[PDB]
DNA sequence: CGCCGCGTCAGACTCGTAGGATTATACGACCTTGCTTAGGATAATATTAAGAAATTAATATTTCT
C-alpha cells in the first residue's frame, strides 16, 4: 500500500498504451495477454511505468534491481533492457545515451 | 698645523590606523590581431545484440529420516 500510494501516485493499474500493470498483483499484461516476466525485468519495468515518460537515471535502476550486496562487475542492465525489449518490443523502451533509458507514452 | 665649513645619514621599541594628489584632452583609414561562428569527417564511445555457456539460483522429486 505505501509503495503504491507514493511511487504509482495511488493507483493500482499503470495503463501506458496496451502496457497495463498491477503492481499489488504483480501481473502486466501486453494488451490482454499475459507475460512471463523474471524478476528483475518485472523490477525494471515497474520503475519505467511508475515514472511514466520521464528518463529515470542508469544508477537508479542498477540500485533497484540490485541489493547492495550482491553487485555484478560487468553489463548486465543492458542486457536486461534487452530482454525486457524483446518480451515488449523495441518501441517501448527508448534509449536515452548517458542517462539511462525512457518507457515512451507518446 | 690646525682648523673649517660643505654635505650627509641614520637616528629604540610593542600595539591599531580613516582618506588620500586638478590642469586638459580630434577623426579617418588601413592593417593586423585576438577572439568568435561553422561545417562536415572522422573518432571515440556508450549501448545493443546474442548467444552461449556457465554458473547459479531457484523449483520439483524422492530418498532418507
Redo the contacts with the bound molecule.
Sequence with gaps: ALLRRHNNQGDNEISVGNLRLNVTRRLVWLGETALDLT?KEYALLSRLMMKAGSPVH?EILYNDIYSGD?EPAT?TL??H??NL??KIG?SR?R???????MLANN
Design positions: 524478476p542508469r550482491n553489463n543492458e542486457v533492457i534487452h525489449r524483446e523495441k523502451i534509449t536515452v545515451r548517458g542517462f539511462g533509458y
